[PDB]
Structure formats: structure tokens, C-alpha cells
Structure 1
Amino acid sequence: IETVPVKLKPGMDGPKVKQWPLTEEKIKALVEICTEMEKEGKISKIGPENPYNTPVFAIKKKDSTKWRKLVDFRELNKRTQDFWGIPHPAGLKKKKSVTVLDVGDAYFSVPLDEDFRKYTAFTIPSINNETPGIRYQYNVLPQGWKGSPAIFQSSMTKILEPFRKQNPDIVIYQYMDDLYVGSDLEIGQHRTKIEELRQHLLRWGLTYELHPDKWTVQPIVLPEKDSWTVNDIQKLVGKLNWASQIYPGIKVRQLCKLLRGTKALTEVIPLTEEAELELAENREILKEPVHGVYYDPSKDLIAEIQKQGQGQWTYQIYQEPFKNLKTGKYARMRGAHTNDVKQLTEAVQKITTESIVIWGKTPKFKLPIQKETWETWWTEYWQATWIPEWEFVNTPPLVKLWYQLEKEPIVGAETF
């Protein structure tokens, strides 16, 4: 149809991000994909008078070997005017089960305003720089751009409506290039309905198993011992101490009493009836999340991750210090046993999706990894069309120690 005029935020100029280095096999794929797009006219080569540039890369689509192009418009999105999309269906997070669909191909058939196109410039690198980069530029709505799903809102509600209305019980929420669907139906009943809608999306040209109901936020479980040692108490007291930044009614007072003096770190200490209760009060306090925590849209979402070693990782989603909106743990996936990076990135995505699911926005990550280490290998295990912001940090020792106490199931979710 016609191109709706898009413009940057007042004063912002186009992105000029450098292209990170790409592997040979990755470059090969993008060259194919791109010459294809060129033919199909979605993109067309560009000159040097175009100074902008967004990084591109290639990922793997599930079940197939066929590569998928992925452009990182994080920078372009950021500088793009706002269209104030769809509000958040508070009911999504409630549904028993949710499924995600890749409908980024949809935009391919929609023209992009000609004046904006320049800002979509991207380059394909070349081994050892023996060939100048292959500069392209978009003509249609690009996948990964926030502007895309927006402009394609009418055209989407339209094609969705007859299903939403047909099935008013199921919830459909759209984010970036993805579609989040969640029903309470039985597994069989659910999946088929997805296929039903699928064929429906298929009717125009478009083709993860979540369960928000179980996303419980776990509690901190303090130790418990027959006899206690100076060390055991010394440790405990430090954690409770730190933790009182959250629950102020927490006390170490009495415990610190029976910790005065200078005795063997391994010597057993008798617990005074006062320490007993103090510790019991503390358990009662930690029995639940701190009161008064509510999500505030006007503020960014923050997600911190701590490496607990052995493949275990803890994370906290918050907007205010100690005022977490959600916390959790994450164990690596069968096949990441020697790759820290992989686990980290596998988790980032999971947490991001949940963020989306629950608030409809990706959180800002604080990754316990070195810039160079991450930037060099995450694209290798990335599998979402969207990309979350991030910063690299040094895990305060204690923060790790505290959440390391996160209550774990008796045996866990029993899959008979």
C-alpha cells in the first residue's frame, strides 16, 4: 500500500554502529539471503554518501539448518519517534500455557517510507577485508525494527480479529517480531488451536511452551543445624545483616552476642533461647517477599544475574534496589556443559521473554561477564529476533551469597 512517513526523535541522527567481525560460514549465508532480498526487491545496494550503519548477523532457526538474518536495530529503535502499539493484557501472564510465533516475515510486503530508508543501512563484512563490505539498505519494513510491528498494527488486528473474536478465551499479545498466545486449554486442545490460528496466519503468509502459572518467586531459606559452629554463625550473621537492607525487621543482635570473644572457627556454640527466637522471627520474615513492591511503567526494568557456578545462575528483576518484582534461578540446558557464555545467553533470553510476557517490555541486563568475552560470542547462541540492552558488572560477593539461599523444591516439578 502507501508508506506512512516515519521520522527520528527530534535531534537524533541515524545509527552509525560498526559491524562486528563475522565468521566465514555466517558471511556466506548473509550474502545468499541478501542477494535474494535484492532480487525480491526488499533491499537494494547503496553508496558511500550514506553514512549510517547497523550491525547484522546470522542465527539458526529451530529444527532447520537454514540460517536466518538478524539485524541489530537497537540503536535505530532507540532513536525512532514513538507511535503513541498495543497495551499489556494483564491476563496473559495468568493463562496456564503460552506459545510464541515468528511473524517477522509479515512486514516484508510493506513499503518503508523512502526518506527513512537511509537509516537502515547495514554492511556485510568480508574475511580479512579482502573485499569491501556489501552495503545494502531496506525498502520494506525490516524485521527487528520497532517501527515495523507498529505500522503493521491495523493489518494485524485485522487478520487476528476473526480469531480473537472466534476464541475470546485465548489471549494474543504481539511483541516486536513475535506473537504471544496463551490459553488455559489442555495441552492437546491448546497446540491444535495454535495450528488452527497458524493456518489462519498461513492464510496471508506467516509461519516455545510457556507456563506463567508456575513462575513463582521463591523464598530465602536460612540454614538449620543440630549444633552450630562459630563459622556457621559468622556466615549466617553476615547474610542476614546484608539482607536487612530488604527486611528491616531482621535482627542479628542476639546472634552477635554469642559471637563475641575469640574461639576456634570450628568450635560448636550453644544457641541461647534469645538467639533461637531471633532466628525464628527472621525465618518468619523471609517467608514472603517484601510488601509494597509494584511495577511502575514510567521506569526501566532491570534484571541482574549472578553466577552460582556448577551451571546454576540466580537473577533478580527489579526497578528499585532490594525492591524486586521477580527473582529466580536458572539451570543450563543439556548441551552447554562447557560453555559459560551459552548458559548466560540462554538465560538472558528466557528472562527477557518472561519480562515481555509479564510487562511487555525487555529489561536492562546486568551481566556478570566481561565485555570482550560476551561481545565475542553471544551472537553464536542468540535465538530471538529482539535484543535486550545490557551492561557488564562485578558481582558483589554477598548478593550472590544471599540469593544462593533461594528455596528449592523438595524434588522439583515431577514429570512422572
Structure 2
Amino acid sequence: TWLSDFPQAWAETGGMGLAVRQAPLIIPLKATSTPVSIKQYPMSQEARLGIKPHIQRLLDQGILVPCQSPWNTPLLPVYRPVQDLREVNKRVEDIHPTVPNPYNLLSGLPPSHQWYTVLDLKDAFFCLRLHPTSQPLFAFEWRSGQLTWTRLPQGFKNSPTLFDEALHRDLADFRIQHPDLILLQYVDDLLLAATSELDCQQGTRALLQTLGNLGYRASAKKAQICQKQVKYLGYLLKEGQR
């Protein structure tokens, strides 16, 4: 089936992603910013044990590395690790928000394309590398020393925009090679639209092959492939309605 033909494209089979064509991102600070080091709220053993294997997996994957940084933000003591990056966000230069609202994005769907494929990318932000100069920005304490992210982190205010822009650059060629297909991108949520079941299945094969090649990974479990009706961005797409 779909899973077997494209082992590289699916998170289930291809391993953790890494966007090989994308240069490691440099994150510019506002002109007056200096590092802020916020103390870690003491964590209960229950929370620590809950979070631990997630931290170990990320270390194993090279997504977290040890560091010493003048920056520090807290992990929430209440599992799965959630970092409060608000004080970092305040010190990072704003970028223009280029991610379209879903209502506007969907206006780009013609009544002519009614065969749909929906993919969502797994651990999307983690596919984007962070330049070593920007890594220390995102440090947190783990017990003893600090760890930090080598990839675009959750909770960082510019992650959705930077990811959406990176994927747009990576999929520019695909769009050109398949000028009849409709591809909607909302950060990590993709909808491919076609006129026929055949166009859709050939399109979908090409999109998966392309994604896998670029280093992105889709969720095989959640994939809606070549259906006349799909869920996308909390809409039900059917009869060309919605």
C-alpha cells in the first residue's frame, strides 16, 4: 500500500526528519536585547520521571544537546516537557506574519478539484536546523546543567512562520512540475487537490516522494489519501463545500 511504496516519506518508517536543503536558521535579536536567565521552578519527582524519557529520546536524536548559556527559560513543573519561552520571545526581533488564515487559504480551492489528499507533517519544527549561534537562546535546565535545542523549538513565536516559509521554498519546484494540482499549505498541514482520482494518486505519489526526499515526514496514521471527502483545518471538505 501507500506505506510500503514510500518508506522515507512516513514518520512511521523514515525516522526523524531533517530538512536537508534548508540552511540552519539564525534568529536575530531586537537591537537592545541581552540574555535573560530565569530560574527553573523546582520540579517534583513525578514530573521529572514523566518528562525524562522524552528528554532522553531528544538527546538520542541530537535534537537536544548539552550547553552552557547566559539564557535560561523554565520547563513547566506540570507528562511531556513544555518550555515557557515568553521572555525569549520578547527579546527576538519580530517578523511579518505570512501564514494565511485558514478561511483565506481555503478560498484558493476551486470547485473543479474534488479529489483530495491530506497530510500532516510530524515534528515539523524539529526538521528545521538552528544555527549554532542561535542555539543558546533556547537553553533550559535539566537535572545537572543546561540543555538546548539544535532545531526550531516549540513555543518560539516565529516557529510557525519560519516553518511555513521554509516548506514553501522546498515545495516551489513541485508546484511548477505539477501546475494542474492545487496544494494548500498551513504550516504542517497540507492539502493536495486534483481533478481525477488518477491525478490525485499520481500527485500524491509525487508529493510523498518529494517530501521524503527533502527530509520531511508525514503521519501515515492520520493520512487521508485520495478521498472525495476529507477533514482539513477543522473543516469537512465535501461536494466542494466549505
Common topology (TM > 0.5): yes
Cα distance between partner residues in 1 of 2:201 and 2:48: 38
| Secondary structure at 1:4 match in 2 | coil
Aligned to 1:105: 126
Over aligned residue pairs, what C-alpha RMSD do you find? 4.2
Matched, 1:160 2:174: no
Q: Which blocks of at least 5 consecutive residues in structure 1 are unaligned?
A: 60-68, 125-131, 216-357, 359-416
Share of identical aligned residues, percent?
Answer: 16
CA shift at 1:107, angstroms?
Answer: 0.8
| Secondary structure at 1:105 match in 2 | helix
Matched, 1:200 2:210: yes
Q: Alpha carbons of 1:185 and 1:78: their partners in 2 closer, same or farther (altered >3 Å)?
A: farther
| Secondary structure at 2:57 match in 1 | helix
Name which of 37, 40, 50 aligns with 1:26.
50
Name which of 76, 85, 93 aligns with 1:81.
93
CA shift at 1:45, angstroms?
Answer: 2.1
In structure 2, what residue type is equivalent to 1:92? L
Q: How does 1:135-146 map to 2 (within 5 A)?
A: 135-146=146-157
In structure 2, what residue type is equivalent to 1:7? L
**Normalized against structure 1, the TM-score is what?**
0.36
Name which of 75, 81, 97 aligns with 1:55.
75
In structure 1, what residue type is equivalent to 2:92? T
Aligned to 2:106: 92
Q: How does 1:2-401 map to 2 (within 5 A)?
A: 4=26, 6-8=28-30, 10=32, 14=36, 16=38, 18=40, 21=44, 23=47, 25-37=49-61, 40=62, 42-47=63-68, 50=70, 52-55=72-75, 59=80, 71-73=83-85, 76-77=88-89, 79-84=91-96, 86-88=98-100, 90-92=104-106, 95=109, 98-102=118-122, 103-108=124-129, 110-112=130-132, 114=133, 116-124=134-142, 132-148=143-159, 150-151=161-162, 155-165=166-176, 166-175=178-187, 178-183=188-193, 193-194=203-204, 196-207=206-217, 210-211=231-232, 214=236
CA shift at 1:71, angstroms?
Answer: 4.4
Contact 2:125 2:152 in 1 (8 A): no
Contact 1:9 1:80 in 2 (8 A): no
CA deviation profile, 1:123-177 (whole Å, cap 9, x unmatched): 33xxxxxxx45521234433553444555666533320122231454233242xx
Q: Which blocks of at least 5 consecutive residues in structure 2 are unaligned?
A: 1-22, 223-229
Contact 1:173 1:179 in 2 (8 A): yes
| Secondary structure at 1:53 match in 2 | coil
Q: Alpha carbons of 1:58 and 1:199: their partners in 2 closer, same or farther (altered >3 Å)?
A: farther
**Normalized against structure 2, the TM-score is what?**
0.56
| Secondary structure at 2:120 match in 1 | strand
In structure 2, what residue type is equivalent to 1:104? F
Cα distance between partner residues in 1 of 2:91 and 2:169: 28
- Matched residue count: 191
Greater relative contact order, per chain length (Cα 8 Å cut-off, separation 6+): 2
Segments of 4+ moved more than 6 angstroms: 186-189
Cα distance between partner residues in 2 of 1:16 and 1:185: 54
Contact 1:44 1:138 in 2 (8 A): yes
Q: Alpha carbons of 1:162 and 1:168: their partners in 2 closer, same or farther (altered >3 Å)?
A: farther
CA deviation profile, 1:201-252 (whole Å, cap 9, x unmatched): 100211155246649xxxxxxxxxxxxxxxxxxxxxxxxxxxxxxxxxxxxx
Contact 1:172 1:180 in 2 (8 A): yes
Cα distance between partner residues in 2 of 1:9 and 1:173: 32
CA shift at 1:88, angstroms?
Answer: 1.6
| Secondary structure at 1:44 match in 2 | strand
| Secondary structure at 2:67 match in 1 | coil
Larger Rg: 1
| Secondary structure at 2:137 match in 1 | helix
Aligned to 1:327: none
Contact 2:37 2:70 in 1 (8 A): no
